[PDB]
Structure 1
Amino acid sequence: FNDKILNEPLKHSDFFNVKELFSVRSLFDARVHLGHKAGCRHRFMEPYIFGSRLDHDIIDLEQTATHLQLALNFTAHMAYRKGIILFISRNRQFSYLIENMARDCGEYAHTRYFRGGMLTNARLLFGPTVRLPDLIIFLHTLNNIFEPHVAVRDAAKMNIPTVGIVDTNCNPCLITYPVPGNDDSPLAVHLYCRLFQTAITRAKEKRQQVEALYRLQ
């Protein structure tokens, strides 16, 4: 009789109403639409890009809004169903912000050097009975040598869904929910952290009220 508290969000479209959390104005003033130059482009971000202004690229904020709606909906559904989300970035500028966002919510952050076999040789590295994260969110998909991330590839290896902020010089190929937007500016990164933290929290208390109602009936 618990499959109702585990199936009603799955039929209610936009169950957490996360659409009221962001607008194209909010992304525009957070400078999400800005990107790299035309020489720093990827063939697989050629679909998601509006155009080029003076050899400076601009990402389509409507596609950003739709992909962000889908990504936030997936993130909230996973936090409702009590998964584990690993927030990964290799910024060294926003490492404090990512980790403090996880600790303001209850969730986990890997902003340090990803040692080889963290997600793949996980049973030997940690212990025989460790639950790997059920969702991995990259706020910066590139490492510090501007290469796609080993944990992107390893989440694809161990069948963990991946929500990732992809910039013009990024590879959205093996990311389940790419959000084409700027991740190089403090306003954009702060807005991403704020939206994801708000989604994780609102999902968790929406869960909490649901089984509170379930136990009172």
Structure 2
Amino acid sequence: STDFNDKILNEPLKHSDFFNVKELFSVRSLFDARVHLGHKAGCRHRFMEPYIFGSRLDHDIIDLEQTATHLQLALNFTAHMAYRKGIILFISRNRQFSYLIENMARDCGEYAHTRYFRGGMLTNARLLFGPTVRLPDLIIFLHTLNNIFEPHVAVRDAAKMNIPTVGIVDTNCNPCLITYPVPGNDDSPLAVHLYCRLFQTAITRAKEKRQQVEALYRLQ
């Protein structure tokens, strides 16, 4: 079993992009999806200054170069977790995209929580679910702001429980605690659909590669 675990789990870590995620998107594709349209300068959150390319008529523009790098890293990490068969949970309280996110989660097999977030669903997970419950190994915040324009409590709870968080952070979000922030636009339907497709493809590719490598190992 030692040979199995090594050759399976540690092999992908050797290559920078084992899942070839970089081909899933291009700066041009992000620009078409409008990932780069932020909120007004007044709504800007201080910590998003490094990621904001500039202001155009008091409208922030997110540096798509930084977004491309961050998205590369985040998709790679998500694919790695999927390959390692961890539990991925998509969280977002944007009722406009709740249905899409739920369907994407069902399609990719990973789980989703778009509805109201009961207090302590992570901190008090053992009592709310059971002593043996397995907690999500990775979270993906399609929207990091709750419906009252405040950081989703899930972000802080995940930071507490030490569950890594990929997160689409808008120009008014607070990326301080998100492990893998992806500066971008969380409001454009095109941008959200692009994010959902990218994550679904990454998870599917990771799982299929996992199955293929497992079969390769077992046949020999």
Return the offset for 1:2: 2.2
Return the offset for 1:4: 1.1
Partner residue, 2:161: 158
| Per-residue Cα deviation, 1:94-120 (whole angstroms, up to 9, x for no partner) | 000000001111010000000001001
Return the offset for 1:12: 1.2
SS where residue 87 of structure 1 aligns?
Answer: strand
Gaps of 5+ in 2: none
5 Å-filtered alignment, 1:170-189, equals 170-189=173-192
Task: Indicate which of 5, 15, 25 corresponds to 1:22.
Answer: 25
Partner Cα separation in structure 2 for residue 40 and residue 177 of structure 1: 22
Partner Cα separation in structure 1 for residue 217 and residue 186 of structure 2: 41
Higher helix share: 2
Partner Cα separation in structure 2 for residue 31 and residue 8 of structure 1: 36
| Per-residue Cα deviation, 1:29-80 (whole angstroms, up to 9, x for no partner) | 0000000001000110011000000011100000000000000000000000
Partner residue, 2:121: 118
Partner residue, 1:77: 80
| Per-residue Cα deviation, 1:120-173 (whole angstroms, up to 9, x for no partner) | 100000011000000000000000000001000000000000000000010000
Give the TM-score, by structure 1 length.
Answer: 0.99
Partner Cα separation in structure 2 for residue 88 and residue 2 of structure 1: 31
Return the offset for 1:190: 0.2
Partner Cα separation in structure 2 for residue 170 and residue 2 of structure 1: 39
Give the share of equivalent positions with the same residue, in percent: 100
Give the TM-score, by structure 2 length.
Answer: 0.98
Partner Cα separation in structure 1 for residue 206 and residue 142 of structure 2: 20
Gaps of 5+ in 1: none
Partner Cα separation in structure 1 for residue 206 and residue 159 of structure 2: 25
